[PDB]
Design a protein around this ligand. Structure first.
Ligand SMILES: Nc1ncnc2c1c(I)cn2[C@@H]1O[C@H](CO)[C@@H](O)[C@H]1O
Ligand SMILES: [Cl-]
Length: 349
């Protein structure tokens, strides 16, 4: 029978054998496996989305985006295993290059040198530059979605929440639900934003930089709204100019109800950090998303001067485009699209 990892069956034989657990997500599990064809150990992610429409949308978007993308700092799809007929297909296995660890695991074991912080940050932004050049957003950047090896190569993974940027439809009401990981949410998520602009990813990168500098999450909110209070606990109360960009009266009245909070200087939090790193951090963790630094500007910052080189930083050929609007289609419709997108990998074809 097929192999089984922590109660989950990975029906990936006979090509991929000798499976071993690596990690897990909301509707996914990741193992390592030996590819008998290529004679290398790979990573395989089992995804089981078909009972829920939202999980099918995200599965389709991640597959279509990662099959289109090709970049050294972004995880790629080597192979997709599913059933020969649409009725036997209940799981999708995505085969990827195996990496050794992720940054979340690494930060539990070690304090990074400034040299390693700088190089990791460079690679995050180099990958992000490519993603944003395609008009795509990752929307869930965090240490556990940054894969590493012992030679300090970095790859961004887990594009389940990725979308094409859509600034015209970014506005939403106060206290709306959000799926991306709480500690890395920009303040506007809780006030007026759906996370449909590039500035959402820059904030998360700033949070990651803070964590590399200190091995502490900078904004560890205990609950949805407490997250915003922690952000203001460092940035201080927003200025009148920034207050005036929030039109939502419920959001604006909430901010005006808070006591005044002082801005906490970065070097109190990070007393041993490179001062150029803290200047870049300041520009990434700007309250106002319209004043927040953009990805190319971040790469061009003095902190990254020893690495920034546009002649060695690929961009996408053109903006990514979804043919049809995925938010409406029922999960049975979405399941057919996923079946079609995976046909090229099936034996035959
Ligand atoms: N290719 C890979 N190589 C090594 N580990 C991997 C991957 C992939 I895809 C994911 N992971 C690990 O599993 C967690 C859930 O995606 C991630 O947070 C991460 O720890
Ligand atoms: Cl709350």
């Amino acid at each position: 029978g097929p192999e089984m990892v922590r109660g989950q069956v990975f029906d990936v034989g006979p090509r991929y054998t000798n499976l071993s657990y690596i990690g897990e997500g909301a509707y996914g599990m990741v193992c390592s496996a030996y590819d008998n064809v290529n004679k290398v150990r790979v990573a395989i992610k089992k995804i089981s989305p078909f009972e829920h429409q939202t999980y099918c949308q995200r599965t389709l978007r991640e597959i279509k985006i990662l099959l289109r993308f090709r970049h050294e700092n972004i995880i790629g799809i080597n192979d997709i295993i599913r059933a020969p007929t649409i009725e036997q297909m209940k799981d999708v296995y995505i085969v990827q290059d195996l990496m050794e660890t992720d940054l979340y695991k690494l930060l539990k074991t070690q304090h990074l040198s400034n040299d390693h912080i700088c190089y990791f940050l460079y690679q995050i932004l180099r990958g992000l530059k490519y993603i944003h050049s395609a008009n795509v957003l990752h929307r869930d950047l965090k240490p556990s979605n940054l894969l590493l090896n012992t030679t300090c190569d970095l790859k961004i993974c887990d594009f389940g929440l990725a979308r094409v940027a859509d600034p015209d439809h970014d506005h939403t009401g106060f206290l709306t639900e959000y799926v991306a990981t709480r500690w890395y949410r920009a303040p506007e998520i809780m006030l007026n934003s759906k996370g449909y602009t590039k500035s959402i990813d820059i904030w998360s990168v700033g949070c990651i930089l803070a964590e590399m500098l200190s091995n502490r999450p900078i904004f560890p909110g205990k609950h949805y709204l407490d997250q915003l209070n922690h952000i203001l606990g460092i940035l201080g109360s927003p200025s009148q100019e920034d207050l005036n960009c929030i039109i939502n009266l419920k959001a604006r009245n909430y901010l005006l109800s808070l006591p005044h909070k002082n801005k906490v200087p970065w070097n109190r939090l990070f007393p041993n950090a490179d001062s150029k790193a803290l200047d870049l951090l300041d520009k990434m963790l700007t309250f106002n998303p319209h004043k927040r630094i953009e990805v190319e500007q971040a790469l061009a910052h003095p902190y990254l001067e020893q690495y920034y080189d546009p002649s060695d930083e690929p961009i996408a050929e053109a903006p990514f485009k979804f043919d049809m609007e995925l938010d409406d289609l029922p999960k049975e419709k979405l399941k057919e699209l996923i079946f079609e997108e995976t046909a090229r990998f099936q034996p035959g074809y």
